[PDB]
Amino acid sequence: ASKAVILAGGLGTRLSEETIVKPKPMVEIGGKPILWHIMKMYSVHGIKDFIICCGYKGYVIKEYFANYFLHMSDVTFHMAENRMEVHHKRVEPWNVTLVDTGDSSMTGGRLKRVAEYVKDDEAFLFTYGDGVADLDIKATIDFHKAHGKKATLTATFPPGRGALDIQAGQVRSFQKGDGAMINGGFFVLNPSVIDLIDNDATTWEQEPLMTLAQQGELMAFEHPGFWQPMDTLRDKVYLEGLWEKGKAPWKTWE
Amino acid sequence: ASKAVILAGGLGTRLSEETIVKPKPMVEIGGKPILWHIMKMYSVHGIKDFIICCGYKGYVIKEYFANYFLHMSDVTFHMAENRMEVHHKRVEPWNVTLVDTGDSSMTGGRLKRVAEYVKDDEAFLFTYGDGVADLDIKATIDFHKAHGKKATLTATFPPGRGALDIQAGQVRSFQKGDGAMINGGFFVLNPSVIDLIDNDATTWEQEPLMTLAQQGELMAFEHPGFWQPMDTLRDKVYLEGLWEKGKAPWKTWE
Amino acid sequence: ASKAVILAGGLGTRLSEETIVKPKPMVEIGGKPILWHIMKMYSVHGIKDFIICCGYKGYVIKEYFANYFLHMSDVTFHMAENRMEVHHKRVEPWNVTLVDTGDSSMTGGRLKRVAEYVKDDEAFLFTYGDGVADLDIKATIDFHKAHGKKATLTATFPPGRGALDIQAGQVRSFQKGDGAMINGGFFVLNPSVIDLIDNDATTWEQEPLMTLAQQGELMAFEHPGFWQPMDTLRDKVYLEGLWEKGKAPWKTWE
Amino acid sequence: ASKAVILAGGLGTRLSEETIVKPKPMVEIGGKPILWHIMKMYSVHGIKDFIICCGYKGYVIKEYFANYFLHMSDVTFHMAENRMEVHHKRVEPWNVTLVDTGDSSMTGGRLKRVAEYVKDDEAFLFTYGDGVADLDIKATIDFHKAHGKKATLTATFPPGRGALDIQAGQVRSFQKGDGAMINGGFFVLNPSVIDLIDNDATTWEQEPLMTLAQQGELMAFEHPGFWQPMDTLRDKVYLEGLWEKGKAPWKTWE
Amino acid sequence: ASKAVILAGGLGTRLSEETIVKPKPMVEIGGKPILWHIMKMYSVHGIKDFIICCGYKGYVIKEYFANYFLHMSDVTFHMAENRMEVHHKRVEPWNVTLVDTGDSSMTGGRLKRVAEYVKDDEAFLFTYGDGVADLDIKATIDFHKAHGKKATLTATFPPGRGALDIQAGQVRSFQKGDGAMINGGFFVLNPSVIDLIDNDATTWEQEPLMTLAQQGELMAFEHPGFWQPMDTLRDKVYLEGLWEKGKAPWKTWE
Amino acid sequence: ASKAVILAGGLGTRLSEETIVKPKPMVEIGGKPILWHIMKMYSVHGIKDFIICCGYKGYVIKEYFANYFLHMSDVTFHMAENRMEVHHKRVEPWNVTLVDTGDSSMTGGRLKRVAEYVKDDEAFLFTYGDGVADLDIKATIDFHKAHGKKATLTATFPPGRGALDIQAGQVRSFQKGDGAMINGGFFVLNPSVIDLIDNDATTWEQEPLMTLAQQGELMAFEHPGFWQPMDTLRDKVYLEGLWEKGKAPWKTWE
Ligand SMILES: Nc1ccn([C@@H]2O[C@H](COP(=O)(O)OP(=O)(O)OP(=O)(O)O)[C@@H](O)[C@H]2O)c(=O)n1
Ligand SMILES: Nc1ccn([C@@H]2O[C@H](COP(=O)(O)OP(=O)(O)OP(=O)(O)O)[C@@H](O)[C@H]2O)c(=O)n1
Ligand SMILES: Nc1ccn([C@@H]2O[C@H](COP(=O)(O)OP(=O)(O)OP(=O)(O)O)[C@@H](O)[C@H]2O)c(=O)n1
Ligand SMILES: Nc1ccn([C@@H]2O[C@H](COP(=O)(O)OP(=O)(O)OP(=O)(O)O)[C@@H](O)[C@H]2O)c(=O)n1
Ligand SMILES: Nc1ccn([C@@H]2O[C@H](COP(=O)(O)OP(=O)(O)OP(=O)(O)O)[C@@H](O)[C@H]2O)c(=O)n1
Ligand SMILES: Nc1ccn([C@@H]2O[C@H](COP(=O)(O)OP(=O)(O)OP(=O)(O)O)[C@@H](O)[C@H]2O)c(=O)n1
Ligand SMILES: [Mg+2]
Ligand SMILES: [Mg+2]
Ligand SMILES: [Mg+2]
Ligand SMILES: [Mg+2]
Ligand SMILES: [Mg+2]
Ligand SMILES: [Mg+2]
Ligand SMILES: [Mg+2]
Ligand SMILES: [Mg+2]
Ligand SMILES: [Mg+2]
Ligand SMILES: [Mg+2]
Ligand SMILES: [Mg+2]
Ligand SMILES: [Mg+2]
Ligand code: NI
Ligand code: NI
Ligand code: NI
Ligand code: NI
Ligand code: NI
Ligand code: NI
């Protein structure tokens, strides 16, 4: 397991403020697209080979990687001599495959698209281009191993927009408790699982996932820590804010 | 206890699509402002005396009640004789006090504004102009009674945008469980509680509420049923959809 | 035949610039809602009894008629004595029934709604709240009479956004010619036709109309003259422009 | 001199944020339309008779005055008995004439419209529905008297978005100085001046005013104090802010 | 005749939803800018030399062609070695000249701009960057030949937003008939025609075209088939829809 | 003195119409970003070395310089041979350093960022990426020299949205007069001045500048001529208009 599949084909409707100009994962935190953070999460854990399921506004990502250095460092232009000098040429020990998974495909359909990429894989990683966390991807991987089932997902606690501490009908305090976790993406999967995807129209979180669960083939890796998606403006700002203040839990690297 | 205090002073930022023209509670479900539904929830339970904390775009509510019949029935105009004939003149055994609680006041500040209205009250009811439920307001009231503490709130389950069934690290199914409830408004309160509100700038959900909890003065009425707020467009549509289909749980009346 | 049924329940999507605040027919030309013009077209022809199928933003119309005089004349307020003095109290020998035909109903469904209003009618008139013309409604009526069939529609020439004069493959000039007319609304109808409407979901221009045609029950009254709808901004402006310049063909009255 | 003519027919383009729903002068400060403040400025000085040149979105003003009390006080509805009880019925010793000065008229054209209203007047007052000040309207009036010329305007200092203190090429400090005033509206005028307005298309600030100046018929009343217009959002907020903080210089009354 | 001149300088006002970020012809169908489709229509017919009259947002097109391969295929980045590997490098046997025809120029003015490009041409092709069709460009060309006149245009049937079948005042059915065609662009022209263009301000569809017609120099090539422009959102969606479903008549190639 | 520091990190709030897609200085006049004009102003005066304080949407500038030639000339693509041929390869004898001065930094903070760039400088130039003028930068430079103080700023006359000619209370005419100038940017400065900037949060126009003035270290270079910023749409259009008409005072070059 060394490859990570990342969804980046959505419309970003709930974040049009930005998405009208680019694909929601191309949206930044700390001047860096969220996708990059996520990929930084992987790398930190050994995953340096990615596949990106592009769709709505893909060229944006294409261009991103196509001019990464620029995107990444200061620069000087010696125009008189038509010369470009990037101050910092930082290298990423990555491999990036950008795939047009279709304009109208769903999560399943898209994933199903990039099979060949991970077919012979012992296993591969799959997640959303909208969530960051201080997740221990490795750990997840070994867990998916330990258990041997086709799929592993990361269960997380959600962010709450009025969670309580109630004991004996008495509110003890204003703070999820126990059977209160959700699917935060970060899947560990079996190529074999693609068989579940019927077509482009497939919403991975429907049959595929449901069936797997029903199939006793669905495991949940519990993450108590930091996890946060970005679906709205407030989502951004918050993350933006965390980052400014040197408080980006998800920031597991140098 | 016979009076209900309803907040209607917010900006409705997350629903500007509608709020640019009116106050978020003036937004409708089934052609009726959500406030009306809520008031319909009360009435159904015996509360026919209300106080409305107006603020952002208050005149809208003013006008609403000022021309209710019209708002409510078909009508014929015999213009030649400058005559207006409302088909249906439906009467509400209500009493409505619309109060300008200030343009910049918070939840606490606003409530604090309308004290005089409920000062001599054994107790009064307080909620948000954004949530509907099949709530048994009466029951809550007797519970607040039974317990005698200054405040009662309704604990509810939230609506989830990926809740799981996990047993022994195995995802059993995709569905809150136990210590998974939230504050859904619908408060039963002690006039005495206003003492907690410092000023217009008070966010009721801060000191007042927190202190009450900390004070061992905060009770929680558990509601397992139907509860839904409206903060966004999707929120509306859903509620709109429920309503069309003759599926408005909150609809506890004729 | 003395009653006119006018649709006013649409969303006005293509004219949101205005429709976000009111129902598209409440949009004005010469400071007067387009509906009014249309009703002015009828009156001019003897129709002074109307039924309005309200839906999206109906209260706007309600209010319109409810405060017509105001809407229509200058005014003085002697506030010190809380007195309102409308300069001009112009009377319309009309009768206006405003009916909530539902938020989600279609053209058929809506019409079907207001049956009772025109059931015993020899015949009634039906049109859209979006089109004006120098139409000779009377003439249409007698024609619908002459022919005796259940329905009459007004065939018109459309407005063109690059119509040519081509003879022997040669463009003679830049100017519809012959089998080039459209349905411009302005229907003359048989109560009996409602039987064709299946439900609220009915789009009158589908089965009802089609079936009538197919049924050899559909007649077309040909209008060569002035006809113009308002679906967009440009539509408005144009009409606005026509009006300024004392050039509103549709203006068939004093 | 006892009548004041106030322009309220503009499009409010630079404040669409609000103007899409109402005429810019109907925009509020302290929950009160700016027009009201202005009229409050007059009253404070003895002017209790006004004429309002309506145009873009006039009905809004119509309605405003038509339901002033409501607009102005809290209220209770005894719906069961279809009764409305306004807490505070505050009376204004005013007289208000709302005049449709046309949708497309300019400043001159509009004013020219309401002649009859001030023809026999010794003199009348004329200003914009966008500016507030601690202006001493009386003083202006006596000045216009003292001088006897046809027109008086109020010269004011503008609000600056980087004004300096420069002496001998040295910036002494960051703060208008001397021949640095502008026209802030608040005109004192001679009915006779209308003769200058050619038509609806007249922009008062063009021939009329220019000619008057050129004619040696234009006087300037100098106001050093507080003066502020509202053309943008920031304009509002500022004024809003001033008001909150009990800092509304223009507030010359009880 | 081997060169095609394509207009791409408009503002795209009626499609701002997209045009705010790019020039309307850069808008896509099937992930490909509409311009590309059009050019694909030409190529299919032998035209592989184009001139593009850029204006509003030209750089977008510049960039498009500048990174076509990328725009066109999947890709892999071996960042560690700063390497870019486009999966598919598809070659177009084209030649593309992108010309800034000015920000404010009209159709005539723009065309007039690119004379030199087609001066010595026997003849050249000229059309809009907004329309697709299953047009037989060749055929048109030979027709323009056959006839020898300076200009040929393609006459087409328009798309109708309520076209009827009326015989003897009876609506036979709901479906243009005969002298019902329009100018759908796709012009075949004589360099000589540029002489008609007076300046940048020229709207080709005014004097130039009119004069040609009047001059007995204007021929019309009749196209009964598929023709569709894109001026609005709905226009897109439709085309988008056609394309999905493997139904893009205009798609005359591999 | 040979280096110019130009701010380009703002949000461009008052010009979102354009700024939603790019940084306000990337906005064009005559198809060229305003920054370019400004840099053209410098060059004209001998300044061909620049530093750009990027922030909000910096990549836009990066890309601008990265593909300048393209941005600047017509071009031909010989796609069949994947060849790009820029018609005009115009060289600028410049040097351009693009620096990410931070997303949230202020004017001071940003400048403070690029110290190293001008530390050993006798002196350097500093201005805004929003203003053009027919300024004699050289002259300013020699003046800053002549005087020897740490800072020089350009005092200018502002553009007025109703400036008068008042003598003896009489308005002579409608036209700033004397102690009526403002800070128009175009600073000449002493590296030493950076010591005044406390951090990224510094608004240069606060302590730094104020202190300098207070310090008797602030000189003002008086510019009577043409000066114009671009903060709004109207600002653009005007400048756009000036440019069309061959009337761009600021245009001091070939
Ligand atoms: N058809 C779809 C739907 C989603 N995604 C991806 O799945 C992730 C999560 O989607 P989510 O943010 O919840 O929805 P969006 O499509 O991104 O936008 P919206 O706010 O409209 O739901 C994102 O990386 C999105 O790009 C995708 O590639 N294809
Ligand atoms: N200062 C405030 C804040 C809120 N409310 C009321 O409190 C309820 C819940 O507020 P909520 O919907 O969560 O926030 P809003 O202010 O309504 O709008 P936004 O989306 O911007 O949060 C609503 O009845 C709102 O009118 C209020 O009267 N005054
Ligand atoms: N469900 C519907 C659809 C239309 N209409 C009415 O039918 C007429 C013509 O509709 P049209 O203007 O073509 O569509 P709209 O609904 O008005 O708006 P849109 O631009 O989104 O098509 C209008 O009087 C509209 O109010 C209606 O009452 N109910
Ligand atoms: N044709 C016009 C123009 C202006 N006014 C009035 O003149 C005043 C000042 O106009 P101003 O605010 O400067 O312009 P607006 O028309 O209001 O809007 P915009 O921002 O588009 O300039 C306002 O009371 C406006 O209502 C008017 O009645 N008729
Ligand atoms: N001054 C103009 C006008 C139009 N066109 C081009 O002519 C074609 C047809 O124009 P049309 O779509 O009808 O108008 P647009 O300018 O594109 O936009 P709008 O909706 O505002 O009319 C398009 O390729 C447009 O780019 C152009 O180059 N220059
Ligand atoms: N934090 C800031 C503020 C301003 N600037 C730059 O300072 C100049 C002048 O700023 P101004 O136009 O007045 O404000 P903006 O930030 O550009 O936008 P807004 O309209 O929101 O004020 C511009 O070159 C802007 O890019 C900057 O780099 N950083
Ligand atoms: Mg989604
Ligand atoms: Mg998401
Ligand atoms: Mg809130
Ligand atoms: Mg809420
Ligand atoms: Mg419709
Ligand atoms: Mg229509
Ligand atoms: Mg104006
Ligand atoms: Mg103004
Ligand atoms: Mg056009
Ligand atoms: Mg077009
Ligand atoms: Mg700024
Ligand atoms: Mg500025
Ligand atoms: Ni270098
Ligand atoms: Ni009656
Ligand atoms: Ni009177
Ligand atoms: Ni009472
Ligand atoms: Ni490779
Ligand atoms: Ni070449």
Side-chain angles (χ1 to χ4, degrees), chain C residues 7-15 24-25 53 101 104-107 110 128-130 230-231, chain E residues 234:
Chain C
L7 296 175
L11 302 195
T13 93
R14 338 155 245 175
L15 198 37
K24 162 178 119 165
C53 306
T101 45
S104 30
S105 334
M106 317 303 276
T107 60
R110 249 160 231 313
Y128 312 99
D130 75 344
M230 169 150 78
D231 301 296
Chain E
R234 315 291 181 337

Side-chain angles (χ1 to χ4, degrees), chain A residues 186-198:
Chain A
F186 299 99
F187 298 98
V188 179
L189 324 136
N190 225 79
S192 60
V193 184
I194 292 149
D195 306 329
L196 307 222
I197 330 121
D198 285 286

Side-chain angles (χ1 to χ4, degrees), chain B residues 37-84 86-160 162-175 177-237:
Chain B
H37 297 84
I38 298 152
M39 301 176 57
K40 283 285 287 187
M41 284 161 40
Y42 279 95
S43 179
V44 167
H45 282 265
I47 307 317
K48 337 199 149 127
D49 270 47
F50 316 83
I51 307 85
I52 316 318
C53 306
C54 311
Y56 172 68
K57 303 200 144 261
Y59 193 79
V60 183
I61 323 202
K62 269 169 180 211
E63 196 271 356
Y64 184 57
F65 303 93
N67 305 278
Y68 185 84
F69 295 169
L70 192 39
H71 281 283
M72 310 293 301
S73 147
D74 292 335
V75 53
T76 314
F77 287 101
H78 286 303
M79 1 201 54
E81 42 246 92
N82 199 30
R83 245 183 244 143
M84 177 171 78
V86 160
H87 305 173
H88 324 285
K89 263 144 222 229
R90 246 178 260 202
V91 201
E92 288 306 6
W94 300 335
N95 296 282
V96 187
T97 290
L98 292 210
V99 181
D100 175 355
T101 45
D103 313 21
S104 30
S105 334
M106 317 303 276
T107 60
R110 249 160 231 313
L111 162 60
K112 181 184 123 244
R113 300 295 226 75
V114 311
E116 341 173 300
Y117 295 92
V118 300
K119 58 167 322 182
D120 290 285
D121 252 40
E122 14 240 273
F124 68 94
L125 314 87
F126 183 58
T127 197
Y128 312 99
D130 75 344
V132 290
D134 53 353
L135 186 69
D136 184 336
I137 300 156
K138 246 142 180 188
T140 85
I141 279 158
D142 299 319
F143 165 96
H144 176 80
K145 242 275 215 115
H147 75 65
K149 323 233 148 201
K150 337 197 261 186
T152 303
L153 57 61
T154 312
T156 74
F157 284 113
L164 357 142
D165 184 17
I166 331 169
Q167 254 141 62
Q170 169 151 168
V171 185
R172 239 168 115 170
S173 111
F174 297 99
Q175 301 176 153
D178 61 2
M181 292 184 100
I182 62 155
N183 156 38
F186 299 99
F187 298 98
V188 179
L189 324 136
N190 225 79
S192 60
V193 184
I194 292 149
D195 306 329
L196 307 222
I197 330 121
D198 285 286
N199 45 52
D200 290 355
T202 316
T203 286
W204 166 247
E205 294 75 29
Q206 287 297 279
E207 296 75 355
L209 261 193
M210 287 153 138
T211 316
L212 282 149
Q214 179 69 208
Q215 247 208 23
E217 286 312 284
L218 185 56
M219 286 329 238
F221 181 106
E222 316 183 14
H223 170 78
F226 180 80
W227 182 81
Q228 181 71 47
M230 169 150 78
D231 301 296
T232 62
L233 207 58
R234 315 291 181 337
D235 277 352
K236 201 174 151 337
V237 173

